[PDB]
Design a protein around this ligand. Structure first.
Ligand SMILES: COC(=O)N[C@H](C(=O)NN(CC[C@@](O)(Cc1ccccc1)C(=O)N[C@H]1c2ccccc2C[C@H]1O)Cc1ccc(-c2ccccn2)cc1)C(C)(C)C
Lengths: 99, 99
């Protein structure tokens, strides 16, 4: 689909069998979601944004659906102000910017 | 043009008679650039992202050119870790997400 940007590019994602709302963010390198539970062991990671950095838990090879498009990749979990889908997953669903 | 997301979507912008590199950020509500001088009146604003909030100066009706596409709008100036082009300007150059 083609999503204009007059409003936030919020979409429904499915992870761990649950539906959540997330922001398609071309400015984000990675994908970070609000506190939730995920299987397996996690690794530490520090991600930086506009206001500084936050510590997050890194889970790899996690199945995640974005607007119906299936993806399997790294999902970060921590105190993010909002759920954000970064380029690591945007590339998996074949997303591009066009103008 | 069509910008892939394998790498950060960086483009050249023209503003305040200066040439700078900025990031096309669909996850950004506003456009915020690192410290620079801009003409006209301004007012303080607190914007938040991963990490918390930072204080920036808000300049309105500022002419800007992105990848050859002219537009005008609000430009924020402050201690942002990187130059960001938000939705307020992405819409003007007809930028959309596609997959
Ligand atoms: C390489 O680092 C990243 O890609 N970080 C991601 C990220 O923050 N991306 N962000 C964009 C993030 C976001 O879109 C997330 C958000 C969306 C909605 C609500 C709250 C947060 C954002 O903050 N948006 C705000 C925003 C941003 C600019 C102007 C106005 C506004 C208003 C808000 O909409 C861009 C960015 C890139 C690099 C550095 C950086 C850091 C250190 C060193 C060098 N560079 C700092 C900011 C993330 C997510 C933490 C993985």
């Amino acid at each position: 689909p083609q999503i204009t940007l007059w409003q936030r590019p919020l979409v429904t994602i499915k992870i761990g069998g649950q539906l959540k709302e997330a922001l398609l963010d071309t400015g984000a390198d990675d994908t970070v979601l609000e506190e939730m539970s995920l299987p397996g062991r996690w690794k530490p990671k520090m991600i930086g944004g506009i206001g500084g950095f936050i510590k997050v838990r890194q889970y790899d090879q996690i199945p995640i659906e974005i607007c119906g498009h299936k993806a399997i990749g790294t999902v970060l979990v921590g105190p993010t102000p909002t759920n954000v889908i970064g380029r690591n997953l945007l590339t998996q669903i074949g997303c591009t910017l066009n103008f």
